Amino acid sequence: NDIARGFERGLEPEKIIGATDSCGDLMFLMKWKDTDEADLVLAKEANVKCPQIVIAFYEERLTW
């Protein structure tokens, strides 16, 4: 995307703190390790790079 470039920062992902599809492609707001900083990353790319972090996020918000 033009917008999600968080992984270009080269920091270790720690936890997704939000998500949006408001720019078409699903993004996550990713918090990095040992900082309060977060940045938008593409979901497609997080799926590959930090699948457990992606899943932990989906799991935390299951509804029936």
């Binding site: 998500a19 989906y58 918000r61 299951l62 509804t63 029936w64």
Partner: peptide, 6 residues
């Protein structure tokens, strides 16, 4: 605010 609905 997302919520995966199953």
């Amino acid at each position: 605010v997302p919520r995966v609905s199953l």
